[PDB]
């Protein structure tokens, strides 16, 4: 019913175990489908059979799994899921994924039965602000800003002094620009260097963190007068 | 000091633990002194020097986990067929003698396990025969009566074990050489699945068919020896093959045992009585006994005799024979047999291989619905002078029941069935399919407990000692498993009425832990004549520890097991006390949410409640 | 930062890990530890666990301070205000260093064991008996760490309460200015200042604290190895201002072993007898090389007859001695170096008396392992504590001792510490001493064949047997053979064997005499020796390292300069070591620089000298140059310096190590203390025997760039896994047999002999 | 039962480390192109030593398998049928079998099994 459907991201697990596609029938109207709290990068449904009135028909794909391979297949099947039985529209009973009560009783579970299937729902779910972004900062905030950037598919640019040439945020970034020198004033605070850095790397935006040029309004204004988007409030507000 | 004759492996280990490195060295030195080589004792071609015993023992002390070595300081004999580097190798042929610079892989394994080699043991020359008379080093007598033959070709090894000099010995078996001498000497003879024991460092003599074999006084020791030597060696022995995972460990009580429709005895009247009685005893273990025409198997045996397999022996010896060594070095019966190979060309060898494959089609169709064959080990207890009179015909007859086993890729265990009127022993060999060696052992155990009730079982020449504890088995070690760890909570528990389903799928008991504090247990509305529980993982907070049994279920078999699991149960995962997650029975909410459902958590398990 | 661990279940926003250099420049934020609970109380508990589970070492942090706050009644009852922390009562369960003392280090016992084959010394206390007394007096588990005081001690402010004791040398000891007794459990209050002054008798004393001192382990031990910036309080001796934490069971989350015993004054019969007059008898086992194949008879007599004076250049690496000059049985040491004390590098015994040229030194607990000189005798395990109390100017005499007597003394110290009962300590006395030095050669196996050479077994200390292959000669096959011997003990799994240490043509075997005695181990070894089977065509896994090296850079040259102005200002290998190689071999200096950049150096052993420092040999026989090791050795060598000792090559993996090889240039250290380097090696020592090192040319300034990059794991070491094939190598020798032989026949002569003569002065 | 019906998009395809062409210059181009095409399906290509397999191949030729043809054809050949019915290259290949003992046949069966140990691991 879930991530093993044709086109979804655990389908491969059926091919690994030499499964063979049989058909695409529905349950009888006796089920409810829940989208479990996403934890992994894979979202997973759980089926729930009801002593009525309220179940619906959910879409299923049915596979022949060699007796010889079924062991290999279930070893890939984690809590709170399991293999039990399900009733098809036609009245035949057939092995299927089921789900522990505990499973669909977690915070974040969404009742998905309306959509009648798990495909429908992963389509009713499925916007890049900037292409490359420079971080006018160092240390821990730089690293944290870059995690978000990464997750967003946005290219990131580090800047560093000389003592920082070996720091995490330099490593984490897609690109980096040495500012040369040691002191705060020599490097991170030097607007000219920073803006040249964003130029040099074609960064459309600069995000400052806190400290340094963060609450510096000349700097916010320099960004504006340079066609680089300062990720922060206006020089005036500051 | 103290008598050592007829000690089990366990007897030896017990001595070593409670003794000192020096008084245990003395016991082996003393054992070595009592043995005599050459023609004085025909059983020994050669014996180790006292210096070599020291060497092996220094080697041994050298080890730092002794008391984990299952054969620590245990003496063994090895067929002069099989290389041990401390002694020459002869094949019962004086001018063939050579000094190996390296141990048999098989020997090397036993030494790694702590054993000490005492000597090389006499055999029919080039391991050719079932009689044991065909050695220029002497004719080894039956351990019970010197008028009788010891059996061959592993003659020394049987003798030596039979009188308890040594609790284990190595032989070889192409077409009976590890089975016939067991029957004639009241021993256990284990003939393992082909390729299980390496043949690296044994002199080839029917390479494609040959197996290393073991003699023991009891099942326990045969088992330990098997576990030690059952090891792959693919790149150095072209016929080596790895045992698969999850070997069966017990046949069902139900098993189908086939016996032959026609049992020729060639005039012999005592041995039929032992066989009949032995068959009665198997029936009494609960086995299904089925009478079956062994035609195809005998056609296979005839193919061996008619065919060109003799060219294998010739292939291994022709360079040597052309050396023209002194006639007195040779047994003439052996050599004439081996030279029978000259009349077969390559084309001939193929024609017979074709016929062999054709017979096997028939043989595999026959065995499809059979678990085990039960066969007399041999029809006769030959007198020394009887095989002197008819030096070929006695041999042929002693191979009535042995010749087809290796050609058919079967395993085999020769096991005592008792004594004839004249106080000689014989017995039965149980024949199983590929990789059944552990289950054969167990089947013997079960056979023994009926045939030798009240611990009345003799061993070797020791007609007035009794097996107590020594025929018991560990089964295959956890080493060999590869399956899903599965927790059962309900009707699949030991003693309830679906336990059998685990046995059908060759499950193995692992342990009996409890869940974590997170579970309730229900009794569901009974519909069948079986009542069924469902587990529920809970977290309001109010769960108990529910009791579980955990089994290893082989991966290739899990399909068969889950197919027997009806709604509303299913297999998911469960949390044990220790925090490990493990596959387990679960239950759809719908299951324990019916009218008739009973909250059973109180009892902590499903047994208490039923 | 030296170790960095965070709870993985919390969110922690940080920018640091094991390896990171934290500067004072910008802002000292390390990490932000963020916890998410069901409600305030759940979150406060989670935050405490998270803080408990946060281990960051290498810098002083505010973790303890955080822990105390997160734990307070204040924070929980939510009586929080912008003012609170300004009047918050913070008391560290710890002491504080008001003054450091000359050389005060955290140590433990037995120390950093397990790694002598690598050249990681045990460290731990220099006088282990006093150390363990001190611990026992306070009822510590014997694994507890304590402070070693050398020459004069610290003054410490205690911020919490505990019990204390001092043992070892005579030192005046103060608690809030009232004299305090040694060997008794002193109760310390809080605000107390403990101060221990100058050591009047002996060199060293020991200050124990109930519950031990709380410092992270490195390689199994909390002992300080200062040379390697390893262990103890952040890899070094204490400093003014340091703050060391204790293990109060109620106010602690600690992995230190809780005390075993109630505190108790040491019985006085169990106290060791320190000399009274700067003069000492010191028991040793004869061997390995106290035999006439190496030293003349009479010099062996003089060695034990005359007294030795302690030299001002003595410390935990070893205690240097002044006395009679050695008469040698050989005219030179051949390929292993010209000076007759020079030896095919082999692994030394703790306590060994090493003849670095014509002067000896006692190898102590911070001492070298794989080394290039002969050793005469070895201080008995249980006698080493004496050597830990020597001061310059002391006189000593080495007193011969049988294996058995040596065990007696040792066992008496263990029974003394374990039971703590009057009368159980045995000490040197005339009826314990052998009448005359004995023969260190325990047995000789004759040569049998080409791959199965003669074997010489030498007694090498209370704790070891040295196994030597061949004539005094290099032969690659013998290296594989040693590997096979080691394999035979493992196959055999021997009980009692502690550690086997590979050298060039030898292996040193350490045993536990309580599990196997000398005679027994000898026989097993003789016996396994015959089980070794292999043919000339062997192969081994071999990693190939390509390493940048600056030829004769400033720091290499300065190491020689320092040696000229501080120790020996001229010698035949002075003023320039490379010119010496060039001159004694009759080549141009740039021929020497050519070989270094072309030769394939096979690692034969590790810890020549310290932290996985290799002893390697060119695979091309035409790359083997005559030479010599220093006489006497340097006391200082720079990190990464490359040396040539006779025909052997070494990389000094550690900064500030004694050294004797001819100095030639500099690489990067092949020791990665924090395993942060950019390579696929899973422990700190980058090399393994049978590995290969090749050098490629860089500029001094290009090398300093690489060095900094590599210390921060931003330098990509060129390493390839492959296989060394002896049958392919034999092949190669033939395709160049004629070149090789012509090179070999023409190597020595009268010129090399004049050198060998001069070198010997 | 359950014969596989598809390799994974991932499968491991082995090609030989050494590809002898015996002077032929055109065919190597097609092979190269074909391997390229396989790579492009998403298959993983690994270059592998085919020695043991060519060792196995020579056994068919040097070895005694030629005796299988002789076994299948000798009764007929002994009739000496008209030379013009026979092709001479074939019959001579086939009569080459006479040079093999039963013993020889085994000797070669052994070597075959030894190679197969290596091939099945490979």
Residue numbers in the entry:
A (entry chain B): 489 to 614, 621 to 732
B (entry chain A): 1 to 610
C (entry chain B): 977 to 1737
D (entry chain B): 245 to 366
Task: Please quote the paper that reports this structure.
The first step of their urea utilization is the conversion of urea to ammonium, which is catalyzed by two distinct enzymes, urease and urea amidolyase (UA). UA is composed of urea carboxylase (UC) and allophanate hydrolase (AH) domains. UC converts urea to allophanate, and AH subsequently converts it to ammonium. Biotin is covalently linked to its biotin-carboxyl carrier protein (BCCP) domain. Its biotin carboxylase (BC) and carboxyltransferase (CT) domains catalyze sequential reactions in urea caboxylation.
We present here crystal structure of Kluyveromyces lactis UA (KlUA) at 6.5 Å resolution. We speculated that the mobility of the BCCP domain prevented its crystallization, and hence removed it. Despite extensive efforts, the best crystals only diffract to 6–7 Å resolution at the Shanghai Synchrotron Radiation Facility. They belong to space group P212121 and contain four copies of KlUAΔBCCP in the asymmetric unit. In the KlUA dimer, the interactions between the monomers are located at two interfaces. One is between the AH domains, which form a dimer identical with the isolated KlAH. The other is between the UC CT domain and the AH N domain from the other polypeptide. This interface is mainly contributed by helices αH and αI in the UC CT domain, and helix α3 in the AH N domain, burying 1000 Å2 of surface area. In the KlUAΔBCCP structure, these active sites are located more than 70 Å apart.
